[PDB]
């Protein structure tokens, strides 16, 4: 019985501000980034582990069901859609803005 | 205090380790001569007060067993003849079988020129090839492998019958068996016992149904790496067997065709009698309530009000859409869509499965080396006992009260996992240092 | 050097089948499952199904069962693998974009996604 | 109790059956099984000889139970004698000192070298 | 006398010549290669098994060695006066080929008891 | 910790402290590799058998009853133990090795028969 819940439906932040996108779920959660309906990319595999080549701005932490996606020092590239995945289920994600 | 270090050699402590276990066995593809004789009376030392953390899926006995089985297959196929001349243009007509509508082309009477003992001469010969063995190039055909790989004909004297092979660890290593019943596949096991060799593990190459395996002890047991994941095949082990009677009712006379000096090609010459269809019979009153036990044990994992549906294979290769196996030397591929069609809501009749026979076999999922099983004289009939299933869940939006289970593909590591689930290999580290009052 | 090309966008009337192609190369294609994802415009991703490259076995949800077929074809030497997704009975709801992704582990980390194939109905 | 029978037994009760584990340490390409099993046998012989050389380097050659002059550092284990030889087993104890094994081995080697030197000087005079 | 020369000599005469037998116990690209390798591994394993058997009984590194186990008369009813003068080792092996296992087990148990007693004595 | 063969160029007085370092590295570990490992094991067993035949079993520094013949070397103790390394001394007793080994074997033989005569009074 997988469940997913993402708290920010809409999201606006200034450049240089730390943002936290909460996705509560049970099981192996991975974080991805989609820009303007173009192909996704894997930011975080498992709770915290970072993929090769990803910027160090993004990081993840695990405590209980919740995961935070602590991104620090937002830049012009970081404005995009961000979503969480457990196995086959993907919730519609937030959208960073300025 | 005044304690001092004392060295003890030969203390009972072990750690996880990987080693090349040897084979003990009580002509075959799996060489009985090459393996050492087994012990007449195996020793099972029960380790009281020992809890051991087993793991089915990271067990290296499965990988070593698979490598050994593949190498045995290759070693058996090495000295036998090569059928490179057989990849030629074949004029194929229908074997005289009235008009059966569908399934008429399952046997094709194909004529071809073959080489002789003399290189300068050829001979027009004929042979009966299955539909799955050939592909059209109106009457021109060729063997299906002629673009992908080359075939080696399996030696006729060599038999494909499984023999029970016991995997014994070398000196300095121990094999811990988890005697605990209802032990799923992983984690703690408080009933442990060391053995010299594992039980007789028949290497049975099968898909969708494990044949001639261990029959569990108490109840039907379901084991998967993670139940939540769909990609992980579910291994089901029955507590009672389901008998299956498989038969190839065609006589299938065999003929010898000299392809070269000292090389022969065994080819079906004539079916003596009515042309019939191979099949497998499963008892209906047994297979239902066997599925009942399986559903009762799946509802523990997936919830009490779930509707457990069983459906046939979604697609894929022939080895996976159909229960593939080897019966007496011929390779059967049975539909089994009548077995897996059910819907279970929480609240002397036989199932006949039509089997297609094949001769060009690409075993162990390998591409680049194919085998040609020779024909077998006379009718062949075998009685095997289904002791389990491989399954795959549908996944997707499982939030609804439905759970579709389809038969699973043949990796053949799942076949060895169902037999080596209780066994683990450990290395004994005899050296130890403890504190005691004594001094030199 | 892992690379998952996808076919161009296609337009077809309802009830006529498509053939979405995904060409995988640059890596050992056999050990990693290739999954399919479907994104309606202005909506989150949805799962279409995975296909084992070694055995060819599809697995699809009950929503897409009976319509979607996942197949795979191998060239000579198996360096390039063409994964095809075919939808049989099309409908106005199916107006989405299709990605082919590569699961790499038990984590279901989809390291490499395809460019996309806009199927318009 | 047979081979590895005293595994769940306490340390003291398992010190009486060191022989049954000592014997089973040494009780055991043209073909698929040939070269790999021969390599396994050579590896087993090498492991046994490394263990025997380690025993000989500490002065405990030919002895299943052997005492040494190395004091027991309290940092290695603060537990007393009664709760070691009557409460715990050998598996748990090996898990406890798994870090400190190498330091203890080095101290045993150093102590035996010092003892051999002292014995040689004493015998000389 | 050379290797195995005292096989016909009396037991006491061979007690002083045990060393030459003891020394001569250690010493597919080609048909000879792998077979010679297997023979060498077998010889090494046999020698180490013999040495381990010697060491478990407390007779490590010694050709001749007393033991605490009593010579139970059930194994042989014979007088020491004529065994060491009018008998050869092959015949002696032929008489007591049938109780070697229990004698070896008794030697193992006796040396384990002796080592435990030495540990207890050195404790205080 | 000088390391493996570190004391090879120092005098014997500092070289005898590091016997364990070179003793440990005699058992560090296709057909050719297997033959090399078997030969290494056989060489180690030959050395240990030679030690055990002289009664020096499990003893790096072992004192024996064999007298030192002056014909083997005319030098004195201080010159041997404080002027030359082990390599020079090995070069200096190259041809006298087998005689010393035989004398050690005979002396240990005499010792064991004497011990058996004494213990069986
Ligand atoms: C699991 O079980 C399911 C059933 O539950 C099986 O699905 C069946 O698969 C068989 C495969 O042979 C199908 O039979 C073939 O179907 C084709 C389609 O037939 C109809 O298609 C549409 C239906 O919407 C209609 O418009 C159309 O008029 C047809 O009525 C046909 O192409 C086939 O017939 C033709 O080919 C054969 C051989 O070439 C000739 O003999 C025929 O004369 C004809 O030319 C054929 O009938 C069958 O329809 C499927 N059933 C269902 C209910 O979908 C799965 O195959 C099975 N899976 C496994 C792995 O076993
Ligand atoms: C199958 O995968 C699931 C997750 O998809 C695994 O679930 C794991 O369950 C254990 C408990 O059995 C979890 O440990 C728990 O962690 C937290 C610590 O904050 C806390 O809730 C509990 O105290 C407990 O320690 C573990 O984290 C969890 N894993 C994940 C990723 O959520 C399950 O073990 C897998 N089963 C297999 C491989 O058989
Ligand atoms: C599972 O195990 C059963 C029982 O061992 C296997 O059935 C046996 O298969 C062999 C090989 O074909 C049969 O031997 C043959 O029998 C007839 C004479 O009866 C003859 O045609 C051949 O010369 C040959 O000897 C054997 O009779 C048969 N056993 C029984 C009880 O029928 C079965 O093949 C195994 N299933 C697998 C591996 O899938
Ligand atoms: C397969 O076809 C061959 C011909 O290619 C058949 O062989 C002929 O059979 C008839 C039967 O009346 C004989 O008179 C001919 O002499 C045969 N010709 C040959 C061998 O060249 C053969 O019977 C067919 N087999 C079947 C239908 O099972
Ligand atoms: C060898 O030849 C066979 C028969 O032509 C090929 O199988 C067909 O390949 C085409 C082209 O991709 C497909 O459209 C057909 O559906 C295939 N038929 C089957 C699988 O029955 C086969 O691909 C060739 N081998 C290769 C390319 O390795
Ligand atoms: C069929 O399954 C059953 C249950 O495991 C097996 O039948 C047993 O056969 C042995 C001899 O091999 C008998 O001693 C047992 O009594 C039988 N069991 C019962 C419950 O009667 C049989 O071996 C399986 N078939 C195979 C392996 O081909
Ligand atoms: C396997 O068997 C099934 C049924 O046994 C075949 O699928 C169709 O089944 C429906 C009923 O569900 C029948 O009305 C159709 O006639 C069956 N199709 C055919 C072609 O007979 C299925 O085709 C079989 N699979 C094979 C032969 O690969
Ligand atoms: C018989 O063989 C022909 C080729 O000669 C093939 O096309 C056909 O399908 C087969 N069946 C019938 C019924 O003619
Ligand atoms: C066999 O050889 C003959 C020789 O004349 C040729 O005409 C015929 O077409 C060949 N048949 C096949 C099946 O290759
Ligand atoms: C079955 O799996 C669960 C998974 O949480 C594990 O805790 C349990 O110990 C397993 N059962 C046995 C008998 O090992
Ligand atoms: C299988 O055949 C046996 C005889 O060999 C028979 O007793 C049994 O009932 C059959 N089982 C079926 C048809 O399911
Ligand atoms: C299978 O057995 C179950 C349990 O006895 C029963 O409810 C069900 O109706 C049976 N299914 C059949 C006869 O198809
Ligand atoms: C289940 O599928 C089989 C496939 O052969 C079919 O014969 C059978 O009628 C189906 N069962 C039901 C209840 O429709
Ligand atoms: C198969 O044919 C042979 C002759 O080739 C015959 O003796 C045998 O009885 C036949 N077997 C049957 C019809 O089962
Ligand atoms: C297991 O431990 C209990 C105490 O927990 C003890 O009484 C029993 O003898 C032990 N069993 C063994 C060592 O076989
Ligand atoms: C190593 O020692 C630390 C404390 O110093 C302890 O927590 C740890 O468990 C030890 N390691 C193992 C593998 O037991
Ligand atoms: C047996 O041979 C030895 C020498 O090998 C000799 O001393 C002895 O006298 C021989 N026995 C008899 C009865 O002459
Ligand atoms: C033991 O072996 C001897 C010699 O082979 C044989 O004659 C005898 O019957 C066996 N049993 C006993 C009790 O000595
Ligand atoms: C090398 O020679 C010097 C000369 O003074 C000496 O002190 C030193 O110990 C020798 N050995 C090493 C290993 O440095
Ligand atoms: C041993 O004698 C040989 C001559 O046979 C001589 O060349 C060699 O140097 C001598 N070795 C010594 C004295 O170490």
Tab-separated table of C-alpha atoms in Angstrom, chain C residues 2-91:
chain	number	residue	atom	x	y	z
C	2	UNK	CA	24.780	5.369	-22.772
C	3	UNK	CA	22.220	6.653	-25.264
C	4	UNK	CA	18.459	6.045	-25.610
C	5	UNK	CA	17.202	7.612	-28.840
C	6	UNK	CA	13.476	7.849	-29.540
C	7	UNK	CA	11.419	8.131	-32.710
C	8	UNK	CA	9.831	11.341	-33.932
C	9	UNK	CA	6.417	12.552	-32.834
C	10	UNK	CA	3.461	10.862	-34.520
C	11	UNK	CA	-0.116	11.883	-35.342
C	12	UNK	CA	-2.870	9.317	-35.863
C	13	UNK	CA	-6.647	9.007	-35.645
C	14	UNK	CA	-8.310	7.015	-32.806
C	15	UNK	CA	-8.307	3.236	-33.084
C	16	UNK	CA	-5.159	3.051	-35.238
C	17	UNK	CA	-2.016	1.557	-33.716
C	18	UNK	CA	1.280	3.364	-33.168
C	19	UNK	CA	4.879	2.107	-33.017
C	20	UNK	CA	7.011	4.103	-30.575
C	21	UNK	CA	10.662	3.090	-30.913
C	22	UNK	CA	13.467	3.470	-28.370
C	23	UNK	CA	17.003	2.632	-29.499
C	24	UNK	CA	19.370	1.838	-26.622
C	25	UNK	CA	23.128	1.669	-27.150
C	26	UNK	CA	26.452	2.354	-25.469
C	27	UNK	CA	25.900	0.040	-22.490
C	28	UNK	CA	25.174	-3.599	-21.672
C	29	UNK	CA	21.459	-3.506	-22.532
C	30	UNK	CA	20.637	-6.941	-21.117
C	31	UNK	CA	21.127	-6.423	-17.376
C	32	UNK	CA	18.955	-3.296	-16.994
C	33	UNK	CA	15.168	-3.184	-17.376
C	34	UNK	CA	13.747	-0.598	-19.784
C	35	UNK	CA	10.549	1.035	-18.511
C	36	UNK	CA	8.020	3.268	-20.255
C	37	UNK	CA	6.470	6.450	-18.879
C	38	UNK	CA	3.556	8.558	-20.100
C	39	UNK	CA	3.077	12.265	-19.368
C	40	UNK	CA	-0.169	14.024	-20.166
C	41	UNK	CA	0.385	17.779	-20.695
C	42	UNK	CA	-0.039	19.599	-17.407
C	43	UNK	CA	-0.094	16.312	-15.483
C	44	UNK	CA	2.313	14.122	-13.549
C	45	UNK	CA	4.116	11.088	-14.926
C	46	UNK	CA	2.340	7.740	-15.225
C	47	UNK	CA	3.783	4.243	-15.636
C	48	UNK	CA	3.186	2.202	-18.796
C	49	UNK	CA	5.293	-0.873	-18.133
C	50	UNK	CA	8.696	-2.512	-18.071
C	51	UNK	CA	10.223	-5.071	-20.411
C	52	UNK	CA	13.044	-7.441	-19.510
C	53	UNK	CA	15.669	-7.237	-22.286
C	54	UNK	CA	16.972	-10.777	-21.706
C	55	UNK	CA	13.653	-12.650	-21.870
C	56	UNK	CA	11.389	-10.077	-23.536
C	57	UNK	CA	8.749	-10.293	-20.782
C	58	UNK	CA	6.392	-7.292	-20.497
C	59	UNK	CA	4.652	-6.230	-17.313
C	60	UNK	CA	1.864	-3.643	-17.540
C	61	UNK	CA	-0.847	-2.239	-15.239
C	62	UNK	CA	-4.458	-3.386	-15.455
C	63	UNK	CA	-5.321	0.031	-16.946
C	64	UNK	CA	-3.078	-0.595	-19.975
C	65	UNK	CA	-3.545	-4.376	-20.211
C	66	UNK	CA	-4.928	-5.622	-23.510
C	67	UNK	CA	-3.899	-2.417	-25.312
C	68	UNK	CA	-0.166	-1.846	-24.805
C	69	UNK	CA	2.449	-4.284	-26.106
C	70	UNK	CA	6.125	-3.925	-25.190
C	71	UNK	CA	8.534	-5.711	-27.549
C	72	UNK	CA	12.278	-5.643	-28.150
C	73	UNK	CA	14.542	-6.447	-31.085
C	74	UNK	CA	18.272	-7.162	-31.186
C	75	UNK	CA	20.698	-6.397	-34.012
C	76	UNK	CA	23.860	-8.356	-34.768
C	77	UNK	CA	26.301	-8.387	-31.768
C	78	UNK	CA	23.493	-6.895	-29.551
C	79	UNK	CA	25.102	-3.453	-29.268
C	80	UNK	CA	21.864	-1.704	-30.329
C	81	UNK	CA	18.469	-2.709	-28.929
C	82	UNK	CA	15.157	-1.414	-30.270
C	83	UNK	CA	12.366	-1.371	-27.676
C	84	UNK	CA	8.930	-0.854	-29.223
C	85	UNK	CA	5.755	0.242	-27.454
C	86	UNK	CA	2.524	-0.311	-29.419
C	87	UNK	CA	-0.884	0.934	-28.263
C	88	UNK	CA	-3.751	-0.883	-29.974
C	89	UNK	CA	-7.005	0.935	-29.143
C	90	UNK	CA	-6.341	4.674	-29.126
C	91	UNK	CA	-8.521	7.338	-27.554
